[PDB]
Design a protein around this ligand. Structure first.
Ligand code: NAP
Length: 416
């Protein structure tokens, strides 16, 4: 439907800037495997309710597919397919031995108890075992899922497999007690910080004391601001939640901001900070802007008023292509949406390697490897940007699709 068709259109506009055969493009349009299963569970009242589960493996040319699991009641097969297609490019732009995967269940978990959630996870694993595995398909954290759900899923997969192989490696995002890896919580934020640092280095901007404006103050936004001020030493001037936002030229420490949000339910009315809306934060003149909220915050209506030199979009496409072009012609170095939030998938890959090899790393080693991976990926995208005279998002799409197409050619899937 709409999401899958929009993803296909994105793939088309990406391909029309690179030399790819038509048959390979057609192969990339259609995902390899779609698995729609019935997930039966018994509720606390004793009645048996069955939900609809989707597992979409878009491609596995580069390696075993990787993909998050979303227990959203509005999840659709088209949405899962589009998300798997996006995951393919997200894992390809970072040079991981992964294909694109995605999972979901049509269910609202707000009405499910802990026992019901455990039963749902266990039954979903029982249903999708034959099309997943450590070397076939790796489920991952996503919207409305917490690491305890993945703990239950890994337990069920280990029970079914009879512990023949590396069960811990079947899924990622597991609790640190069993097969977990450090830096999982700050993964996306740390990747965003590394991308911002690389963008500043490319532009020659020294970030000591510079200005960062972050829209959306979830866990990802708070970690982004905190790690920015810690490593990059930048001055946070404005942070906003889903309700409102605050502004302070002096500098905001995210610790007390998160404390205020936890106490009063929002970051509004911060001591010494002027209360402003999302639009004022977006239009605020800063050195770098980071949208970490619900997607489609920057559109062609409000693109010409953006003044930040670097835009790092953490969310899944919060800036429209028209706004992308407007920012590009304004001399603003943007960051692709799937490139910025690729820290989470990179750290999930790290955890998968830790589980597969049976050796677990420390915070420092994971951070250094993530730094290297993000630096290399961003530099590759920037080199493609400079050479092809195209957009950052288009450059990342070209890199990802070129890698996937080369993998398909090497496997013999496509002869041209
Ligand atoms: N996405 C992720 O990967 C992620 C994110 C955060 C944490 N974690 C992991 O999970 C652990 C933290 O636990 P959690 O995030 O699963 O949440 P949790 O500790 O399971 O939260 C307990 C639940 O009870 C409610 N609650 C909490 N305090 C309460 C109080 N004082 N009075 C009444 N109700 C209360 C909350 O409802 P409300 O939700 O309505 O407040 C919450 O959903 C951490 O160790 C971390 O590693 C993972």
């Amino acid at each position: 439907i709409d999401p899958f068709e929009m993803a296909v259109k994105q793939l088309e506009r990406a391909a029309q800037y690179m030399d790819i055969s038509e048959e390979a493009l057609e192969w990339l349009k259609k995902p390899m495997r779609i698995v729609e299963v019935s997930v039966p569970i018994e509720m606390d009242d004793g009645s048996v309710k069955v939900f609809t589960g989707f597992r979409v493996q878009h491609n596995w040319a580069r390696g075993p597919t990787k993909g998050g699991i979303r227990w959203h009641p509005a999840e659709t097969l088209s949405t899962v397919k589009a998300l798997a297609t996006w995951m393919t490019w997200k894992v390809a732009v970072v040079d991981l031995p992964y294909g694109g995967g995605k999972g979901g269940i049509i269910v609202n978990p707000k009405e499910l108890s802990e026992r019901e959630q455990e039963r749902l996870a266990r039954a979903y694993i029982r249903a999708v075992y034959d099309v997943i595995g450590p070397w076939t398909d790796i489920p991952a954290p996503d919207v409305y899922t917490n690491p305890k759900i993945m703990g239950w899923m890994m337990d069920e997969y280990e029970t079914i497999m009879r512990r023949k192989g590396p069960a811990f490696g079947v899924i990622t995002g597991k609790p640190l007690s069993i097969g977990g890896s450090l830096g999982r919580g700050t993964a996306t934020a740390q990747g965003a910080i590394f991308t911002i640092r690389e963008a500043a280095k490319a532009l020659g901007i020294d970030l000591k004391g510079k200005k960062i404006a972050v829209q959306g103050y979830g866990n990802a936004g708070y970690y982004t601001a905190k790690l920015a001020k810690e490593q990059l030493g930048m001055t946070v001037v404005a942070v906003s939640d889903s309700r409102g936002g605050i502004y302070n030229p002096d500098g905001l420490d995210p610790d007390e901001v998160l404390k205020w949000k936890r106490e009063h339910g929002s970051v509004k009315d911060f001591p010494g900070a002027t209360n402003i809306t999302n639009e004022e934060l977006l239009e605020l003149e800063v050195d770098v802007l980071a949208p970490a909220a619900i997607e489609e915050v920057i559109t062609e209506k409000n693109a010409d008023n953006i003044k930040a030199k670097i835009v790092a979009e953490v969310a899944n496409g919060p800036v429209t292509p028209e706004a992308d072009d407007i920012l590009r012609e304004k001399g603003i170095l943007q960051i692709p949406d799937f490139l910025c939030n690729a820290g989470g998938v990179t750290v999930s890959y790290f955890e998968w390697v830790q589980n597969i090899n049976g050796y677990y790393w420390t915070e420092e080693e994971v951070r250094e490897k993530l730094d290297k991976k993000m630096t290399k990926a961003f530099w590759e995208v920037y080199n493609t940007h400079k050479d092809k005279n195209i957009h950052m998002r288009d450059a990342a799409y070209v890199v990802a699709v070129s890698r996937v197409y080369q993998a398909m050619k090497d496997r013999g899937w496509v002869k041209k």
